[PDB]
Design a protein around this ligand. Structure first.
Ligand code: AMP
Ligand code: NMN
Length: 321
């Protein structure tokens, strides 16, 4: 065993160094000067000379000076199973879902109405306010590790911002959608064609492909965006409602949509659906529908979920744009 202070110092220094290596090489966006970084690395190298067992092929020093940053899409489990959503395509279907909800929990349920973004699902995990893992949906229990790629998304903060009202959770699994804005999708296609590459047929395909890059620097060069729309496993945070949960996401620095509204009953839900039916074209990214969710966490627990989806939510899908 190496002495505890030595090990502590090495770990801390190596992590700080690797982070700047990632920020400089992958993102082309350093956050400390070249001089500052150089002293940092010099120090890590000194520590390793004094204790050569610390020099490993994985060290930011011994091996990885050019880069060692590749995504391999290895399977990684979600903390809580990621489900899909049941759909409704007609007024009748939606009313039937509402009725079922009424029969189980009466008039105690309110409905959060969110815009359904037609992108790529991404699950992020923050441990003690720090981003540790990001993965794809996969089969729901297990997805693919695209942590490095997710680290290049501007909207995804590496660290959560501490706030008076909302303390940083011990563990936070937050779900969101990754997408391109329409103008950015066109721009990307033009750039791809300029290099002799095939363009993407649609923004969803384009987001998926941009996200899933073995080399995260490719992802860093593209304007991916992310909007959080849900919660998985959480520790140190017990929001009464989804809407209140979104306020904490905001305080912490996570990206959330400004188009969400809280309806009190089905008439309110119906109004939002009719409204976005008329105005979804004005949003700068693709919206295929409206997701209706029982807002009260306790009611969500009661209603539960099936193996494939929540009973407490439903996606009202429009006709193709
Ligand atoms: N606001 C949203 N809330 C929940 N899920 C959303 C939202 N927007 C997009 N989605 C995605 O919609 C997926 C289910 O969609 P679908 O299979 O088309 O019915 C989710 O699993 C999410 O990844
Ligand atoms: N400002 C930075 O964060 C940063 C990080 C990594 C490398 N670099 C620059 O690139 C070279 C350093 O060696 P590495 O190639 O591991 O990073 C030096 O020119 C260094 O200043 C800068």
């Amino acid at each position: 065993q190496t002495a505890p202070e030595v090990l502590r110092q090495w770990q801390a220094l190596a992590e700080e160094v690797r982070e700047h290596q990632f920020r400089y090489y992958v993102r082309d966006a350093p956050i400390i000067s070249d001089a500052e970084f150089d002293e940092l690395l010099r120090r890590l190298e000194a520590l390793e000379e004094q204790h050569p067992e610390l020099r490993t092929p994985d060290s930011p020093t011994q091996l990885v000076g050019g880069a060692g940053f590749a995504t391999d899409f290895e399977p990684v489990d979600h903390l809580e199973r990621m489900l899909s959503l049941d759909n409704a395509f007609t007024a009748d279907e939606l009313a039937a879902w509402a009725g079922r909800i009424h029969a189980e929990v009466g008039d105690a349920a309110h409905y959060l109405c969110e815009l359904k973004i037609d992108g790529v699902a991404l699950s992020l995990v923050y441990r003690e306010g720090r981003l540790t893992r990001a993965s794809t949906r996969g089969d729901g229990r297990t997805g693919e590790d695209v942590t490095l790629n997710a680290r290049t998304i501007a909207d995804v903060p590496e660290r959560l911002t501490p706030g008076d009202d909302y303390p940083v959770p011990e563990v936070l699994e937050v779900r969101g959608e990754v997408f391109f804005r329409l103008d950015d999708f066109q721009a990307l296609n033009a750039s791809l064609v300029e290099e002799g590459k095939a363009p993407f047929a649609n923004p969803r395909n384009s987001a998926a492909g941009s996200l899933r890059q073995k080399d995260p620097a490719v992802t860093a060069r593209r304007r991916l965006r992310m909007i959080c729309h849900g919660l998985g496993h959480v520790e140190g945070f017990r929001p009464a409602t989804l809407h209140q949960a979104y306020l904490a996401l905001r305080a912490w620095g996570l990206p959330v949509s400004e188009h969400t509204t809280l309806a009190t009953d089905l008439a309110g839900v119906r109004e939002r659906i009719d409204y976005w039916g008329e105005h979804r074209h004005e949003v700068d990214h693709e919206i295929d529908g409206v997701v209706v969710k029982v807002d009260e966490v306790a009611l969500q627990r009661r209603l539960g979920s099936t193996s494939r989806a929540p009973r407490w939510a439903i996606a009202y899908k429009y006709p193709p744009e």
